Design a protein around this ligand. Structure first.
Ligand SMILES: O=c1ccn([C@@H]2O[C@H](COP(=O)(O)OP(=O)(O)O)[C@@H](O)[C@H]2O)c(=O)[nH]1
Ligand SMILES: OC[C@H]1O[C@@H](O)[C@H](O)[C@@H](O)[C@@H]1O
Ligand SMILES: [Mn+2]
Length: 515
C-alpha cells in the first residue's frame, strides 16, 4: 500500500480538512503510482479538490470525484501515453462544473480541425533519417555516423531507418554505406529505387541531379519528408538530433489531435502601446516530424506536397519578401522564368566572382547602395556612369564621393577591393538560406499548414494548469512533436519564450549552406 499511501498523502498535501486515510482506503483499489502524478499541485484534479475542500460534504464528494476521475480519465490516459497536459484537459472536460473553463477553439492545421480526442497514435521507436552526400567518395561524415551510434544507445531497441541516394556515391562509398548499415542494424532505403506517385519525387531527384549547379541536399531531404511511401509511421528526425532518454515513454506510443505533428514553439513579444498587449507567435520546424499510423496522414501529406509542387513551379512568389528579391539578379531570373537551381547557382557564382562590377550587376542600384551604405549623390553618379566604368572607377567611387581627392599613389587597390568584396559577402547566407527554407523547408511548410498568421494570436497570462483554450495552447498540447517525443532540438524557440530570452538558435547547425 504503503509508499503509495505516502505519495497519495503528499500529493493531497497532507490535508486534515478531510480524513486522507479513510479516503485512501476506498481508493487503494484503483490508485497507482502513475495516477498520483496527476493529482499533485499543478494538476486540474488537485485544483478541483481544493475547491471541494471548501464546500460541504467534502469527504464524500472528493471520494466520488477521485474514483471517477482515476478510473475513467487518468488511468486510461496514462495507459494511452497521454501527457500531463492532455490528462489535465480530459479531467477539466469531464468535470466542467467543478472546473470552469473556456471552450476548446476551432484551429485549422494543414486543413485539419485539431481534435481533443487523442485519437491519433504515433510510434516513438521507429525513426527515419536522411543523408544525401555531396561528395561521391564519402557515404556520410563522421559527425553523423557518431550521432547514429549514439542514438542507438540513448534509445535502446529503436528501429532506425536511413534514406540515401546510391547515385550520389561511387562504388566504394556505396559499399561503405551498406557495410555501415549492416554493422549498425540500420534499415537502408535507396531513394533512387522508391516507387511513388508523389509530385515531390521528380523535384527531389532534380535537386540531387543539380548538386554543384544550384541543387541542395537539405532541399532534397526536405522534400522526402512529405512522400507517403517513405513516411507513414514513426518519426522523421534530422540525423544528428539527440534523444533525451528521460522523455522515452513506456509503451513507445504518444497521441495527438492531428495526423502529422512537428517541432513547435512560440515567441511572446514585449507589451505594445497603448493597451500593453503582448502577442504570441508560433514557431515551427521540420527537424522533428511524427506521422500517425492513421490513413488521414496521407491526406495531410498530399495537401503539403501540392503546396510544395506549386512553389517549385513558381518560386518567385514564395521568395517575394526575402532579401534576394531586392536584387537585379532576382528580377532578371523572374522575368526569364529561371528554375530555383539557376537562381541558387547565380547567387553562389556572384559571390565567388571577386569582381565589384559583377557584384553591382548582381545587386542592382538600390541594394548596392544599401550594402555599401552610399550617399544619394554617390549612388546616382555610379548608376549614371557605371555603363562606362572599369573595376577601378567603381572602386574609387566606393572609397570616396570625391574620387579625385583620393591619393591613388598611396592607395592599396588589392586590399581596398578585398575589403569591399568582404562587406558584400557578409550577406551571402541571408540571400541563400531562404532559397531552401521558403521553398522546401520550414518556411514553406509553415505556409502550407495554414501558417502562419492564422496562428498568430494575442497572449494571455496563465493562471492555473495550462489548458488548450487558445490556438497556440491547442498547438502546444495536441500538435507538437518536440516536447512529447524523445528528441531535443535547439533550432527554434521552446514554447512561450519571451523575446528577450530567445538566445542563439541552432548553434552548431547548418551543414547545407555551400561554401
Ligand atoms: O550534406 C548534407 C547536408 C544536409 N543533409 C540533409 O539535410 C538535413 C538538415 O541538415 P542540418 O541539421 O545541418 O540543417 P539545420 O537543421 O541546421 O538547418 C540533414 O539532416 C540531412 O537529412 C544532407 O542530406 N546532406
Ligand atoms: O529546410 C532546410 C532545413 O531547415 C532547418 O530549419 C531544418 O531543421 C532542416 O531539417 C531543414 O532541412
Ligand atoms: Mn538540424
Amino acid at each position: 500500500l504503503s509508499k503509495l499511501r505516502m505519495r497519495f498523502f503528499s500529493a493531497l498535501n497532507h490535508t486534515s480538512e478531510i480524513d486522507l486515510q479513510v479516503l485512501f482506503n476506498d481508493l487503494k483499489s484503483i490508485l497507482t503510482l502513475d495516477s498520483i502524478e496527476h493529482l499533485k499541485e499543478g494538476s486540474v484534479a488537485y485544483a478541483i479538490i481544493q475547491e471541494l475542500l471548501k464546500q460541504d460534504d467534502a469527504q464524500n464528494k472528493i471520494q466520488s470525484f477521485l474514483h471517477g476521475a482515476i478510473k475513467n480519465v487518468i488511468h486510461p490516459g496514462v495507459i494511452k501515453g497521454l501527457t500531463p497536459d492532455e490528462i489535465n484537459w480530459n479531467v477539466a472536460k469531464a468535470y466542467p462544473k467543478y472546473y470552469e473553463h473556456e471552450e476548446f477553439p476551432d484551429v485549422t492545421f494543414g486543413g485539419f480541425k485539431v481534435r481533443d480526442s487523442n485519437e491519433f497514435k504515433f510510434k516513438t521507436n521507429i525513426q527515419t533519417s536522411i543523408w544525401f552526400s555531396i561528395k561521391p567518395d564519402l557515404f556520410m561524415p563522421s559527425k553523423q555516423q557518431e550521432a547514429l551510434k549514439r542514438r542507438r544507445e540513448q534509445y535502446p531497441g529503436c528501429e532506425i531507418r536511413l534514406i540515401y541516394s546510391s547515385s550520389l556515391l561511387n562504388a566504394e562509398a556505396n559499399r561503405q554505406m551498406k557495410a555501415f548499415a549492416r554493422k549498425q542494424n540500420i534499415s537502408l532505403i535507396d531513394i533512387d529505387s522508391v516507387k511513388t506517385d508523389s509530385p515531390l519525387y521528380p523535384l527531389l531527384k532534380a535537386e540531387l541531379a543539380h548538386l554543384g549547379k544550384g541543387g541542395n541536399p537539405a532541399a532534397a531531404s526536405d522534400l522526402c519528408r512529405w512522400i507517403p511511401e517513405l513516411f507513414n509511421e514513426g518519426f522523421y528526425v534530422d540525423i544528428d538530433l539527440p534523444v533525451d532518454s528521460s522523455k522515452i515513454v513506456e509503451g513507445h506510443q504518444i497521441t495527438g489531435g492531428v495526423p502529422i505533428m512537428l517541432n513547435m514553439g512560440s515567441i511572446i513579444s514585449e507589451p505594445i502601446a497603448p493597451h500593453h498587449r503582448r502577442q504570441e507567435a508560433v514557431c515551427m520546424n521540420t527537424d522533428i516530424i511524427a506521422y500517425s499510423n492513421d490513413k488521414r496522414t496521407q491526406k495531410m501529406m498530399d495537401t503539403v506536397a501540392r503546396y510544395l509542387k506549386n512553389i517549385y513551379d513558381d518560386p518567385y512568389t514564395a521568395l517575394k519578401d526575402t532579401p534576394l528579391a531586392q536584387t537585379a539578379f532576382f528580377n532578371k531570373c523572374q522575368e526569364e522564368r529561371k528554375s530555383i537551381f539557376d537562381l541558387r547557382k547565380g547567387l553562389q557564382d556572384a559571390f565567388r566572382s571577386d569582381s565589384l562590377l559583377q557584384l553591382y550587376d548582381f545587386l542592382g542600384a538600390d541594394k548596392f547602395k544599401e550594402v555599401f551604405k552610399l550617399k544619394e549623390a554617390q549612388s546616382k553618379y555610379i548608376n549614371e556612369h557605371i555603363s562606362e566604368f572599369s573595376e577601378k572607377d567603381l572602386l574609387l567611387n566606393l572609397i570616396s564621393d570625391k574620387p579625385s581627392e583620393i591619393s591613388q599613389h598611396t592607395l592599396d587597390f588589392v586590399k581596398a577591393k578585398a575589403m569591399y568584396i568582404d562587406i558584400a559577402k557578409e550577406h551571402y547566407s541571408a540571400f541563400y538560406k531562404p532559397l531552401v527554407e521558403e521553398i522546401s523547408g520550414p518556411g514553406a511548410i509553415y505556409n502550407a499548414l495554414g501558417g502562419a498568421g492564422s496562428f498568430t494570436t494575442t497572449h494571455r497570462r496563465l493562471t492555473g494548469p495550462m489548458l488548450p483554450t487558445t490556438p497556440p495552447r491547442v498547438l502546444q498540447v495536441f500538435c507538437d512533436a518536440h516536447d512529447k517525443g524523445p528528441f531535443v532540438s535547439d533550432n527554434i524557440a521552446r514554447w512561450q519564450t519571451n523575446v528577450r530570452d530567445l538566445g542563439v538558435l541552432n548553434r552548431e547547425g547548418l551543414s547545407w549552406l555551400p561554401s
